[PDB]
Amino acid sequence: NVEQIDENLAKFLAERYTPESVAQLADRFHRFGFVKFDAANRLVPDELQTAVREECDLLIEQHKERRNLLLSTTGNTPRRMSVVKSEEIEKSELISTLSRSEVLLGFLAGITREEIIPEVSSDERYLITHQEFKSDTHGWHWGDYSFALIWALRMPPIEHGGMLQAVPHTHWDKSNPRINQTLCEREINTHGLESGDLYLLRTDTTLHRTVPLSEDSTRTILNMTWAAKRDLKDLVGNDRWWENPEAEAARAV
Amino acid sequence: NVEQIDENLAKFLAERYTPESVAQLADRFHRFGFVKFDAANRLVPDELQTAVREECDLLIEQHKERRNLLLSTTGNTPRRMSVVKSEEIEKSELISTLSRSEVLLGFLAGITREEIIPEVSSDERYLITHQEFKSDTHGWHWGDYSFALIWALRMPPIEHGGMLQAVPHTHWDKSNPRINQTLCEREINTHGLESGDLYLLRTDTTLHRTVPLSEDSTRTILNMTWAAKRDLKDLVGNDRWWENPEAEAARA
Amino acid sequence: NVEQIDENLAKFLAERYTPESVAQLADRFHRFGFVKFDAANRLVPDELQTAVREECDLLIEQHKERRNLLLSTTGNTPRRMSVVKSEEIEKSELISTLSRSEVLLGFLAGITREEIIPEVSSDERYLITHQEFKSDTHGWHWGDYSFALIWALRMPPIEHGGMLQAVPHTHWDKSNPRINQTLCEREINTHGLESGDLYLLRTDTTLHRTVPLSEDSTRTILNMTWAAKRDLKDLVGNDRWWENPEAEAARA
Amino acid sequence: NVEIDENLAKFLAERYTPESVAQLADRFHRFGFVKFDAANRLVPDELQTAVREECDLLIEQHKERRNLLLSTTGNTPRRMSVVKSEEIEKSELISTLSRSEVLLGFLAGITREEIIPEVSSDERYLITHQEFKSDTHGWHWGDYSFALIWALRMPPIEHGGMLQAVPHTHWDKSNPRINQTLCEREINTHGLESGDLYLLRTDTTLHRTVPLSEDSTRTILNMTWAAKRDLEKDLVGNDRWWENPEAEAARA
Numbered sequence A: 001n002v003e004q005i006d007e008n009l010a011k012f013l014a015e016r017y018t019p020e021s022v023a024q025l026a027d028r029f030h031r032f033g034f035v036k037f038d039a040a041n042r043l044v045p046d047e048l049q050t051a052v053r054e055e056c057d058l059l060i061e062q063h064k065e066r067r068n069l070l071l072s073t074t075g076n077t078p079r080r081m082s083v084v085k086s087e088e089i090e091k092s093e094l095i096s097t098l099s100r101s102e103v104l105l106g107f108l109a110g111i112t113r114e115e116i117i118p119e120v121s122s123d124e125r126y127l128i129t130h131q132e133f134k135s136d137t138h139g140w141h142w143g144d145y146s147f148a149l150i151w152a153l154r155m156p157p158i159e160h161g162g163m164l165q166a167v168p169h170t171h172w173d174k175s176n177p178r179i180n181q182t183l184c185e186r187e188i189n190t191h192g193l194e195s196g197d198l199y200l201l202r203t204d205t206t207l208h209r210t211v212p213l214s215e216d217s218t219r220t221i222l223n224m225t226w227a228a229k230r231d232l233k234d235l236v237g238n239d240r241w242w243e244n245p246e247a248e249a250a251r252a253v
Numbered sequence B, C: 001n002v003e004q005i006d007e008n009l010a011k012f013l014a015e016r017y018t019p020e021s022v023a024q025l026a027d028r029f030h031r032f033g034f035v036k037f038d039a040a041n042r043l044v045p046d047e048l049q050t051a052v053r054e055e056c057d058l059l060i061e062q063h064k065e066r067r068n069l070l071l072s073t074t075g076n077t078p079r080r081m082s083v084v085k086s087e088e089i090e091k092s093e094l095i096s097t098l099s100r101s102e103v104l105l106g107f108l109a110g111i112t113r114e115e116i117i118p119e120v121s122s123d124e125r126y127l128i129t130h131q132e133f134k135s136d137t138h139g140w141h142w143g144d145y146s147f148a149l150i151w152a153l154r155m156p157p158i159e160h161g162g163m164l165q166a167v168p169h170t171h172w173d174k175s176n177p178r179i180n181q182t183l184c185e186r187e188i189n190t191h192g193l194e195s196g197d198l199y200l201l202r203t204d205t206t207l208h209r210t211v212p213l214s215e216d217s218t219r220t221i222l223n224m225t226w227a228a229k230r231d232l233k234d235l236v237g238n239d240r241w242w243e244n245p246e247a248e249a250a251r252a
Numbered sequence D: 001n002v003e004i005d006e007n008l009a010k011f012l013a014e015r016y017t018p019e020s021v022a023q024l025a026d027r028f029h030r031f032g033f034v035k036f037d038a039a040n041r042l043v044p045d046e047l048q049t050a051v052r053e054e055c056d057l058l059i060e061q062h063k064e065r066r067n068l069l070l071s072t073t074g075n076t077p078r079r080m081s082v083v084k085s086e087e088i089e090k091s092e093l094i095s096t097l098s099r100s101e102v103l104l105g106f107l108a109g110i111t112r113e114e115i116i117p118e119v120s121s122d123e124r125y126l127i128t129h130q131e132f133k134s135d136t137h138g139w140h141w142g143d144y145s146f147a148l149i150w151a152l153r154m155p156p157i158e159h160g161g162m163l164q165a166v167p168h169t170h171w172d173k174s175n176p177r178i179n180q181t182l183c184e185r186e187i188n189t190h191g192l193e194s195g196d197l198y199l200l201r202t203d204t205t206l207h208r209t210v211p212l213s214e215d216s217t218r219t220i221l222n223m224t225w226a227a228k229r230d231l232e233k234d235l236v237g238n239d240r241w242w243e244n245p246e247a248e249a250a251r252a
């Protein structure tokens, strides 16, 4: 505990990354809106992710809420999953502090090529999604903020779905999402994930979803959302379905 | 009717296409496994398309059979639709004679850049699919034969799904389809369709599906399947689900 | 003239663009590091284009300085062309005030999605390149600053080269440019240009060159360079060959 | 050295499966190009050393320099030294290997069609030897479907010589439209190293070699074969510059 986390994380990163290799990651982040931290590009120590995973498994058992809706601001794409709200996750001292770590944010800032600002709406700082059943999905969407760090805490086999599909270099018009038309005009990048992986996502300009589960499995992630200088902007849409299951943009079925 | 159809169709194409313009279409076919005949490049006269659509809506009314299964030889991807079998469609003199037309097959032979042989299995010569419910879909799959001309007879709005997604330059291993693995390695091309469109699909090397309907709509196609010189072989998989809903590879 | 330029350009752009259609251009700029303003998407009135072209054709005949060298900071890619220095172009009140026009910078900031800042080095605010001979080229390189609006004043036919090739989402390591290697890993996008076109380029993250002239033709551009907030840094490399032909990185 | 076919069969059998050849067949269709590097060897080192030693002898004897522009390919240059097919065919090693039913039988798993060694007696083989700056095999297609290129000696990538390719094209000798095709399509740059081999779909892939940025040494061997689509075809163009420097399409 204490400042030993940042001290060991800086060491963990200094053993693995250089400015030259981060710049290559920054190129891939700009090109794909997505950079994956796998066994080839570990981001945090095993002992640290295990601690975050055990914190999230306790939050799921205590505060999971089922969501089964369509979001009108993203072309009525579905949100079929369980969630844990940001206000409940922020109680975790481990998750809240590491999410504001200047060591972590300073490292990822070399990938984004701009400052990562931990000042987002109090209902969207953190998110856990927990999909368990067939057809569970985080439908096509964008984010209100620029940056999200996703912890692929548990992934089903790729044959069961659950991959992240992404279209970079897009934009979110809440009154006219044009999701299926964007797919017709653009190539979809499918990103397979494994348990233990993390990935950085440029959420405001990358249209993305999780491929629906073809079988009852378990797909669990943690979302750390941060702002860019561009997001310091007014929230609109009435579509905060995770914080409010009956938001104005949430539709039945 | 009759041979006046081949003569009229030959005139229809000579007004619109040249070998130079077909050659550019052939390039796109090899690159995408897919070429679309839309309002800017019609394939058949509107009178002829209306005659085929009226024929298919009749066969649907009389011989539709709901399918709701998963196909093991394509990674348990769903087949959630209603179909009309090839043997019932062949009874239509219009569709069967048009599917073996020396004018139509000869013209598309300049896009495929190889001979289009109408020597395919009697249960796969033709197929009509009729999706009408939310989540209805023709899951990811390949074709046993090389060529299929799909008539997009009725397409819902793009915002309701029903697009054709495709991954060209792949191959079908029925013992190990690797569908989701292929998607992770390849970019997906999504092709929107409108009612009246037609498209040619290289079905053996293009992994493809139809995007599931996001609500109750109607999506109706006619499939004309032909072979290349490479398909003149033996079928495998026990997965002919459209003809046999209880095929071995079909699951609930 | 003078203040009427902003009032005229504000009315010109207002009749040809919407926030929705500018957002689509921002996508293409993010995706390719490049967006072209051609006959489909004009940026300036024809009267304004002719005035700027006339100015440049004067500055050419008065300060054209031949450059034939290899720049070590970009893998010794050639620079075979004539140039006109920024300090010389700065004397033109038209080109200088246009580069700082709140209407011009304000509109393009919807494509870059970030503020465009006309605070760059005094030797790189403006540049005119004038390629005239076979094998003349502006070799593979990056820009020291983020943004550049290029005025394709006079382009040869595409059969004579002169197209802009680009690889977006890269970066400039002046100690290890890795140019040909990056080409082996990335798809090269070729952008053909016509006389009167303009294009906004993200020069810092887009590796780009002009295809060498296959024969003695005339290729003339005006380069307006601007900074993003990220550029407000130390110039490095001793490679300012356009202002100093005897630069350290320049192999004559 | 005898009947090589037993030795090559055991070599490939330990390094390939039908499932991994099919993945190469995917890449060959998608890119018109499949490279045999250290990751995927095609011939043993003892055979590569023999083929290389044979060619280096054919060079020192029958090297004619070509410095021309080919009209049927948009006047793209051909600055190199060559050795005609008739001179190369005198090598018992190259000719028997080029017709080996073990080599062809394996590569036909990548092409997915029969590879027929019935091609013109002046285009069976070709050795090109680029040694000076600007030396290049300019943008072009091939009259025949396939070519196995032996990258016997490749300079470092900083000196150029990489193969650039645009798959899913075709050769219109009356209207090549090379630079236009480049403006419409992405260029794939393939870096080669000494000892590499690659299979090229030469009729549908527009390809060239990047000019040597300086005096280096780029040596290749070309084994051109036909597909059934090339059988007994009528060669046209008057552009056989390799066999005939004064060909009708060859411009100085």
Ligand SMILES: NCC[C@@H](Cl)C[C@H](N)C(=O)O
Residues within 6 Å of the ligand: C071, C074, C079, C124, C126, C127, C138, C141, C142, C143, C144, C148, C223, C225, C242
């Ligand atoms: N902005 C005008 C000068 C730029 Cl074009 C120089 C560039 N870095 C190069 O290497 O040619």
Ligand SMILES: N[C@@H](CCCC[NH3+])C(=O)O
Residues within 6 Å of the ligand: A071, A074, A079, A124, A126, A127, A141, A142, A143, A144, A148, A223, A225, A242
């Ligand atoms: N905007 C997203 C929710 C993200 C919540 C966490 N950043 C959606 O519509 O699904």
Ligand SMILES: N[C@@H](CCCC[NH3+])C(=O)O
Residues within 6 Å of the ligand: B071, B074, B079, B124, B126, B127, B141, B142, B143, B144, B148, B223, B225, B242
């Ligand atoms: N092979 C396809 C069926 C094609 C039937 C018409 N050619 C599938 O698995 O669904």
Ligand SMILES: N[C@@H](CCCC[NH3+])C(=O)O
Residues within 6 Å of the ligand: D070, D073, D078, D123, D125, D126, D140, D141, D142, D143, D147, D222, D224, D242
């Ligand atoms: N067609 C090629 C020559 C190939 C010779 C060997 N196959 C060219 O235009 O240069």
Ligand SMILES: O=C(O)CCC(=O)C(=O)O
Residues within 6 Å of the ligand: A127, A129, A138, A141, A142, A143, A150, A164, A208, A209, A210, A221, A223
């Ligand atoms: O579950 C995932 O990987 C994606 C989540 C996402 O895009 C979001 O939280 O908005």
Ligand SMILES: [Cl-]
Residues within 6 Å of the ligand: A141, A142, A143, A144, A148, A203
């Ligand atoms: Cl998001």
Ligand SMILES: [Cl-]
Residues within 6 Å of the ligand: B142, B143, B144, B148, B203
């Ligand atoms: Cl099919």
Ligand SMILES: [Cl-]
Residues within 6 Å of the ligand: C141, C142, C143, C144, C148, C203
């Ligand atoms: Cl530049």
Ligand SMILES: [Cl-]
Residues within 6 Å of the ligand: D140, D141, D142, D143, D147, D202
């Ligand atoms: Cl060739």
Ligand SMILES: [Fe+2]
Residues within 6 Å of the ligand: A141, A142, A143, A148, A203, A208
């Ligand atoms: Fe998201």
Ligand SMILES: [Fe+2]
Residues within 6 Å of the ligand: B141, B142, B143, B203, B208
């Ligand atoms: Fe199909």
Ligand SMILES: [Fe+2]
Residues within 6 Å of the ligand: D140, D141, D142, D202, D207
């Ligand atoms: Fe060639």
